[PDB]
Design a protein around this ligand. Structure first.
Ligand code: NDP
Ligand code: NDP
Ligand code: NDP
Ligand code: NDP
Ligand code: GDP
Ligand code: GDP
Ligand code: GDP
Ligand code: GDP
Lengths: 338, 338, 337, 338
């Protein structure tokens, strides 16, 4: 008996995880938000999958779904997951990402499955914020830098408390940034690949970004959902960092993406006046707008996943250069039909 | 200076109202929910229009948006608007549709606009529920029949209270059911037009409905948004019913719809056993499934818009027959493209 | 098996209801809010009674409590119950009085007791607000006049909806104003009795009120909680107005309270400048301050409780004059200490 | 000139802090919760103090109060502060202690006072939970052990975020346990001093406790509120541990309290069967009940306040022995009356 309940199923990770579990024969249930428009685009092709309307801010609907499903595994991937947006939607972010994790854990307990279900919490490298060690590992002290990070830090600890207080098998996946052709358009990587594709297809000339110098450890979401499953197959509930260990800047993501389009970006200027120009035509394709900057930036992330490699036999499979090429090519094809 | 702020701008009505106001030279602002997927499909062609991330359950976010926008007219169309879904998402529905209306009124008062802004609240014929008079007018006593109805009733009265307590120009548009080619696919009219369109195209053979006997007063959303604006142009803030005054059953909507694709439906059986088959080929095209029924149904609605005619000089332009035709043709063209 | 769960057990009504049910041999459980200070003053003498920490804004705590208690009767009396206060705490009032009622109903359902518990909702005459008929009865249309009234109106209908959708035995008691020596200090009657008692004791010289001309139908809370239990004893779940049918103004409550400490108030002036002065001593003891007015007043309330008299055989025992005397005498004794 | 706004003014710390600030000539404002009973007992003798009704879960009321008061200093002491209660009131504790801190910070920002107010957050040694270093200091990593600790940890970091993101002068006082004759009756120290006083007076014979072996750093609340004010007088906003650095067990607090009433307690038995019996009379005066234990105990706390001592010139004045004597003596006088 393998029955998974995935909150956040319509999102990037939930769509890949649903495919991964379905491939292993699981009965997969997802919680979907009511929307005035179609919002199951990433999982429509899958429709052993059953969807249920619900919301992490509504405790009763969570108890009803859990009681009906009686899941053996629960992956809480549901979240307002964008950092910039969390600065103006701070309360909504706390209620969903923080208190919502509590509501889900308490629904499991109310449903009497405290000793039967395994629970995965979608923790994040954003918890390290202004990093206290480089690279960051499980024992590196957290230092959140946004309402999103603080809300996720509450969720990380309430999951630890349910594990310690009630013996729930619950684990925190401390995942560093992971992208894919399904990444939300609002994250920097997908914003770049979509924009570069458009410029290639002549649908766009230039686009603006915020902080070009931010440095990230970027992996492919498909590889990372496999780590979530591996953490719930472990004999004991443990928390793990999952990451690539390699760092690149936003500037580098931009340069490599344009290379796939046949253009070489040359940078000129500083700060909000810096621009990215085609080395040949001299045409400006990238500009900077402070409106995209964060009040308290997270300047650098680099994860050390030695524990996961040794205990779960997990490892990144897709590297940075291949990730970038895949996203640009996927968006060129997508935009082609536009 | 005409600056409108529309909550629920990505929904059916918000998309038509944005068009209507843009056409009048308004500066239009909309509050959009953060989503992991693209969710501005109904208004993307409008890109005079400014969108702001927000949520009716986050008070500060509404204050920030209203201070930045400084609107002269606010239309609160945002809501979890589906009745059936409200039974399992009762709390979220009360928080968004009921308390959210107060959050928006309180943001207005906090932003110092109580004496300058005009506020439109999206009330609804669902307030009459188990109807206390036929037809229903502004003075017919309410009798909600779902968590949605109850939440909208709290919103109706908190709006009346800000009007009476603080002289805010605030009104309740008590609109009866209105549809269009942009209607959510989950509502009965669009579920029928889309399903009939697929059958015609050979992309579907049969679909199931819930209660065939329910009767509704159905108008076209494009006509009704005009009445919203007119209420905000009236000299005094008053509440108004907006409706066609004509009633049809779900069964008749089904019949007229198949008629537009050259099929005549004949019914057999009763209750959940009843079926709809092509009178010419005898093929079953419509079945019933209890899962679509509601615990406490709203059997009948017929609205009386005499007051709106007298003070607004308003009257519906599209009638029932034209509405069904338009939706079925629209969906045949949409399904044909994919 | 008689097990009652009372939300709002520390408040006026909850305290009288808990006593009434304990006298009938019920096992009584109440939900109490965590407080930094002692807050069980009204029910300490009762401590058959068990208390549980909880809050109507925390869903899980309500499920936990109900699951443990398995009550046969639930009385939802918990609420931010003050009208003036609701204008400045309109959202908290909505969340506790409106959504909190839904939270308790869903907890019942979640716990599998939808068919085994009888539920009483503390509805109110404030629902009639700007009254649409006089007197007001079960069928008089509602017209709320404050964030409190709107929130209680939502509660009223969500209770009807659980009754209609799921066959829960749930009832709305539409109670008109009821007071007692246990009434909160900031309601008008207790404000007047405590202030009049302090004046008699030489602890105060004068106090200010708001709208002296408001009219109310005032009963005694001890009489009204009996009606709540009667509603749950009824064969079918029905809604009932509970009231005295007699009206008095705030001004009359003031006059009668002063007569009980040996003073005759004589009014002079108008509106915010009106004052009540002692006939014998010539001292001003009552003034008016607009800060006590409500933006949208409820001018008049008079309940018709024919239905309850007929079906429940309920009748109020304490009349207005006796309520005033009891409140003033009790506060004179209370303030002496 | 000097205007303080204190949330949690009716509690133990708020009552002492109000007195400390009134002595310095401050105009002191407090936020008090609406209650069906008198709830201002600790501050009624103060009657330059003004009270405002409000709740940390209602943002509109906080904006209204901060606008009216325009404080130069805000002390956020308001909280559901009991650890045991937080296990069954986890969501309410999160909404008040965690999110409520965000609401108060956002209200300061909405009110335009981000650059003029100084903000003190009531952080706590419970943040160290399962302690990662002994003694604990500012740089010791947090490890919360209850819904109260997780909620306070969200609050600690959202305060840090407003300081860094918006230059708010905001500080976290990481205070270790502090008690007084005004401590809440449900906390262990006051439970013991009240019970022992009743025993001395003949009003009680025995009482039950939970975990006798817990160890704590106990100081006197009057000394500690002085530190809160000192942190807001510092030139730069910094976080500080405030504590005595001396540690005792619950068992020693029981033993010393009984000594003040002329009794020597002798322990017998183990775990939930352990009892404390009078050496002279052999009467049992203390028993153990597992219902007072916590699922995840905080076994030991010892604070290192070296930073505060050096930068603020603060030092604890009341030592443990005197704290116990004062509390038992005050409770004997209190109970003598009734
Ligand atoms: N991707 C990354 O690089 C990293 C992500 N994370 C975290 O991992 C998880 C997965 O991330 P990812 O797939 O990219 O995120 P997405 O933003 O793509 O997806 C978020 C999901 O959560 C749902 N959701 C949001 N709010 C609610 C709510 N109130 N109730 C129920 N569901 C809700 C969304 O639904 P809807 O479609 O309706 O919006 C969507 O299904 C998230 O928790 C994210 O914070 C952790 C480390 C790094
Ligand atoms: N249409 C009808 O027949 C009738 C409708 N009404 C009411 O009129 C209004 C418009 O109806 P209609 O356009 O059909 O409804 P839709 O369901 O099409 O649109 C609802 C809108 O509200 C938004 N919304 C939902 N929840 C929130 C939230 N928490 N915060 C912010 N925005 C939110 C939706 O966003 P998203 O796209 O992200 O879901 C969408 O923009 C609604 O209030 C509805 O209840 C009244 C009478 C009859
Ligand atoms: N009395 C009247 O004249 C009328 C009253 N009513 C209603 O009847 C009920 C009883 O009234 P009455 O006793 O005078 O009211 P009180 O104000 O004296 O008592 C209210 C009770 O509700 C509790 N409460 C408030 N908020 C919450 C919350 N969030 N969670 C849990 N409990 C909460 C209070 O606790 P705490 O002590 O912690 O504040 C108290 O126990 C109320 O619902 C009131 O609205 C109806 C008709 C008329
Ligand atoms: N004392 C200690 O040993 C330690 C305490 N702390 C923290 O320091 C602060 C002061 O502690 P202490 O005085 O002992 O605590 P108390 O429990 O004595 O006081 C708590 C205060 O918060 C108020 N409050 C609770 N909930 C709300 C709400 N929703 N809205 C508004 N006000 C509310 C209480 O009001 P009401 O009277 O109505 O309940 C009371 O005024 C708290 O934040 C506590 O968590 C930090 C370190 C150690
Ligand atoms: N989303 C986003 N990030 C940007 C942009 N320009 C630069 N960045 C930076 O890119 C980094 C990664 O951002 P994002 O993809 O949102 O993921 P995060 O690591 O979860 O914040 C951060 O340092 C952002 O500030 C932009 O336009 N959008
Ligand atoms: N949404 C929906 N309604 C259905 C269906 N079958 C019958 N109905 C009924 O059609 C009526 C209109 O439903 P809907 O379009 O959702 O709008 P409402 O009037 O706001 O409930 C109600 O009485 C429904 O019970 C169905 O499959 N879906
Ligand atoms: N609470 C209160 N009510 C007052 C005061 N002065 C006049 N009233 C009026 O007395 C009536 C009853 O108020 P209250 O006892 O609060 O009960 P309500 O009927 O629940 O509002 C209302 O019309 C109030 O406006 C005053 O100082 N306090
Ligand atoms: N409140 C309380 N704590 C107890 C009791 N018996 C032992 N303790 C322990 O004493 C310690 C202090 O508890 P408390 O005074 O509530 O403060 P905390 O340090 O904020 O939990 C904790 O380890 C409790 O488990 C008891 O009966 N009540």
């Amino acid at each position: 008996r393998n029955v998974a309940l995935i909150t956040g199923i319509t999102g990037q990770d939930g769509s890949y995880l649903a495919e991964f579990l379905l491939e292993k024969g699981y009965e997969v249930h997802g919680i979907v938000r009511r929307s005035s428009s179609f919002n199951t685009g990433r999982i429509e092709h899958l429709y052993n999958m059953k969807l249920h309307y619900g919301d992490l801010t509504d405790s009763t609907c969570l108890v009803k779904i859990i009681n009906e499903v009686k899941p053996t595994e629960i992956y809480n991937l549901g979240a307002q997951s964008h950092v910039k947006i969390s600065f103006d939607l701070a309360e909504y972010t706390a209620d969903v990402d923080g208190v919502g994790t509590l509501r889900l854990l308490d629904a499991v307990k109310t449903c009497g499955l405290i000793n039967s279900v395994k629970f995965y919490q979608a923790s994040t490298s954003e918890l390290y914020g202004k990093v206290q060690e480089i690279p960051q590992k499980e024992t590196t002290p957290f230092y959140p830098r946004s309402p999103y990070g603080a809300a996720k830090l509450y969720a990380y600890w309430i999951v630890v408390n349910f594990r310690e207080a009630y013996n729930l098998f619950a684990v925190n996946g401390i995942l560093f940034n992971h992208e894919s052709p399904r990444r939300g358009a609002n994250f920097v990587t997908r914003k770049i690949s979509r924009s570069v594709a458009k410029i290639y297809l002549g649908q766009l000339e230039c686009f603006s970004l915020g902080n070009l110098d931010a440095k990230r450890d970027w992996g492919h979401a498909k590889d990372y959902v496999e780590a979530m499953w591996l953490m719930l197959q472990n004999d004991e509930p443990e928390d793990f960092v999952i990451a690539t260990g390699e760092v690149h800047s936003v500037r580098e993501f931009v340069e490599k993406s344009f290379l796939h389009i046949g253009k070489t970006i040359v940078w000129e200027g500083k700060n909000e006046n810096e621009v990215g120009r085609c080395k040949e035509t001299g045409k400006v394709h990238v500009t900077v707008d402070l409106k995209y900057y964060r009040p308290t930036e997270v300047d650098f992330l680099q994860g050390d996943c030695t524990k996961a490699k040794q205990k779960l036999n997990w490892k990144p499979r897709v590297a940075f250069d291949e990730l970038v090429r895949e996203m640009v090519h996927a968006d060129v094809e997508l935009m082609r039909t536009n």
